[PDB]
Ligand binder design. Structure first.
Ligand code: HEM
Ligand SMILES: [Ca+2]
Ligand SMILES: [Ca+2]
Length: 367
């Protein structure tokens, strides 16, 4: 039967109401209403948790979106492909005891939904509840890495959950709010687009620009040349230059994915809706949705899309594009004014001094 929650929210099932206080606590204690570092790491964790499942290897290889990262924090977070996931894992573990009626699998996906809601332009994603509270650790080798080629990436996603090439590119819209801490051992928080706190299509445009240098070292595994490599970190600042992943470049130019990649450029609603649909599928890997309950109403309403059009960043323009898609013309877009590269802020407030919540915990990392 229907019910009304603590905060006035009408739900299809009263058990959804347990998520209201969880959302409040996730925000007050970790996310702080921001599309910042902790939000981004938690969104990354939804993927590392969910994708560790394999049709061909069978259920013993991994249970998908099952909270295995939180329940066995000494196993999967320490596999090489998940280096750095310890931060999100350690931030979420305390909520397991604070909200004991909510399974680890549900906690991971709900935290991701809440984190996304903090990012202007992100969709209000579906949230189904009821993932069982027990599982076992997945095997190693199920998480794509940035040095992987498109055939490998597409096969891994198909084997995980039957994702199509369009759905894979749609999921990679997440790199609009993504940065790298481990790819380059000399850089922290190297952003993948010029607006890492805005859920927009800048990532799609900016990967199509010609690379001209590197924000740090020039020979990291999984990294390729960036169109906007400079930052202020050589003088002690925290505004790291833009980084490009090999996998994003590869997706942008492969015949199976290039038109889907370009198709999101300056198509905000299409991008956000496409991400939402693919992400809802990701969030329930390892489950029959018949066995879950719809609690979508308790996902917060996201911050609205920004007013700003999609544009070329300062010092770039259409002459710098490397295009691969014959089926759709790249749209005419304005160029941001400026004679030098604009520093990409380290913080959503435009400054460099922001700090993030980090709980201590059992998961670890390396360099
Ligand atoms: C081919 C598939 C993918 C590859 C190779 C990949 C690779 C990466 C890499 C190398 C990083 C940087 C980690 C670091 O060094 O700190 C990263 C960050 C991130 N990834 Fe992806 N990723 C993939 C798919 C996804 C998907 C499907 C999602 C979610 C739907 C996702 C969400 C994120 C987010 C939000 C971050 C940023 C974390 C932060 O800024 O703190 N990724 N990814
Ligand atoms: Ca898992
Ligand atoms: Ca962005």
């Amino acid at each position: 039967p229907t019910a009304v929650c603590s905060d006035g929210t009408r739900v299809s099932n009263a058990v959804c109401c347990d998520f209201v206080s969880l959302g409040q606590d996730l925000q007050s204690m970790v996310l702080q209403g921001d599309c910042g570092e902790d939000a981004h790491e938690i969104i990354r964790l939804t993927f590392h948790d969910a994708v560790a499942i394999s049709r061909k290897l069978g259920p013993s290889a991994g249970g998908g979106a099952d909270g295995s990262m939180l329940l066995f924090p000494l196993v999967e977070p320490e596999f090489a492909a998940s280096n750095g996931i310890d931060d999100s894992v350690n931030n979420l573990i305390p909520f397991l005891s604070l909200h004991p009626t909510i399974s680890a699998g549900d906690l991971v996906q709900f935290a991701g939904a809440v984190a996304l809601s903090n990012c202007p332009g992100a969709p209000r994603v579906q949230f189904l509840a009821g993932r069982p509270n027990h599982t076992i650790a997945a095997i190693d080798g199920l998480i794509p890495e940035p040095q992987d080629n498109v055939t490998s990436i597409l096969e891994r996603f198909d084997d995980a959950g039957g994702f199509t090439p369009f759905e894979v590119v749609s999921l990679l819209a997440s790199h609009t709010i993504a940065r790298a801490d481990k790819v380059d051992p000399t850089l922290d928080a190297a952003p993948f687009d010029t607006t890492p706190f805005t859920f927009d299509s800048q990532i799609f445009l900016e990967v199509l620009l010609k690379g001209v240098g590197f924000p740090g070292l020039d020979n990291n595994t999984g990294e390729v040349s960036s169109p906007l490599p400079l930052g202020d970190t050589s003088t002690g600042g925290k505004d790291t230059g833009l980084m490009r992943l090999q996998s994003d470049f590869a997706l942008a130019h492969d015949p199976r994915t290039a038109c889907f990649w370009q198709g999101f450029v300056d198509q905000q609603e299409f991008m956000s809706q496409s991400f939402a649909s693919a992400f809802a599928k990701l969030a329930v890997l390892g489950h029959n949705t018949d066995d879950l309950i719809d609690c979508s109403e308790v996902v917060p309403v996201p911050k609205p899309a920004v007013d700003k059009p999609t544009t070329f960043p300062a010092t770039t323009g259409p002459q710098d594009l490397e295009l691969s898609c014959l089926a759709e013309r790249f749209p005419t877009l304005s160029v941001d004014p400026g004679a030098q590269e604009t520093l990409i802020p380290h913080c959503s407030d435009g400054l460099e001094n922001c700090t993030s919540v980090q709980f201590s915990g059992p998961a670890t990392d390396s360099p």
